[PDB]
Amino acid sequence: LTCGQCQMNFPLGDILIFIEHKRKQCN
Ligand SMILES: [Zn+2]
């Protein structure tokens, strides 16, 4: 997944990381 806030791209199977960032790291 890719998030503009963190401006980073992730390959398939790494969606878990995206959720964590948007959890408490993406405020
Ligand atoms: Zn983010």
Swiss-Prot record:
Partners and quaternary state? Homotetrameric; self-associates via C2HC-type zinc finger domain. Interacts with MTA2, a component of the nucleosome remodeling and deacetylase (NuRD) repressor complex. Interacts (via its C2H2-type zinc finger domains 4, 5 and 6) with promoter region of gamma-globulin. Interacts with NR2F1, PIAS3, NR2F2 and NR2F6. Isoform 1, isoform 2 and isoform 3 form homodimers and heterodimers. Isoform 2 interacts with TBR1.
Zinc fingers (C2HC-type), as residue ranges, are 1-26
User: What does the UniProt PTM comment say about this protein?
Assistant: Sumoylated with SUMO1.
Q: What is known of its domains?
A: The N-terminus is involved in protein dimerization and in transactivation of transcription. The C-terminus of isoform 2 is necessary for isoform 2 interaction with TBR1.
Annotated Zn(2+) 1 binding sites: C3, C6, H21, C26
Q: Where in the cell is it found?
A: Cytoplasm; Nucleus; Chromosome
Impact noted for substituting L12A: Abolishes self-association
Q: Please give the tissue specificity annotation from the record for this chain.
A: Expressed at high levels in brain, spleen thymus, bone marrow and testis. Expressed in CD34-positive myeloid precursor cells, B-cells, monocytes and megakaryocytes. Expression is tightly regulated during B-cell development.
Q: What is the effect of changing L16A?
A: Abolishes self-association. Reduces expression in erythroid cells
Question: According to its UniProt entry, what is the function of this protein?
Answer: Transcription factor. Associated with the BAF SWI/SNF chromatin remodeling complex. Binds to the 5'-TGACCA-3' sequence motif in regulatory regions of target genes, including a distal promoter of the HBG1 hemoglobin subunit gamma-1 gene. Involved in regulation of the developmental switch from gamma- to beta-globin, probably via direct repression of HBG1; hence indirectly repressing fetal hemoglobin (HbF) level. Involved in brain development. May play a role in hematopoiesis. Essential factor in lymphopoiesis required for B-cell formation in fetal liver.
Superkingdom, taxonomy of origin:
Eukaryota
* Organism from which the protein derives: Homo sapiens
Under what name is this protein listed? BCL11 transcription factor A
Associated disorder: Chromosomal aberrations involving BCL11A are associated with B-cell malignancies. Translocation t(2;14)(p13;q32.3) causes BCL11A deregulation and overexpression. Intellectual developmental disorder with persistence of fetal hemoglobin: An autosomal dominant disorder characterized by delayed psychomotor development, intellectual disability, variable dysmorphic features, including microcephaly, downslanting palpebral fissures, strabismus, and external ear abnormalities, and asymptomatic persistence of fetal hemoglobin.
Question: Altering I15A: what's the impact?
Answer: Impairs self-association. Abolishes self-association. Reduces expression in erythroid cells
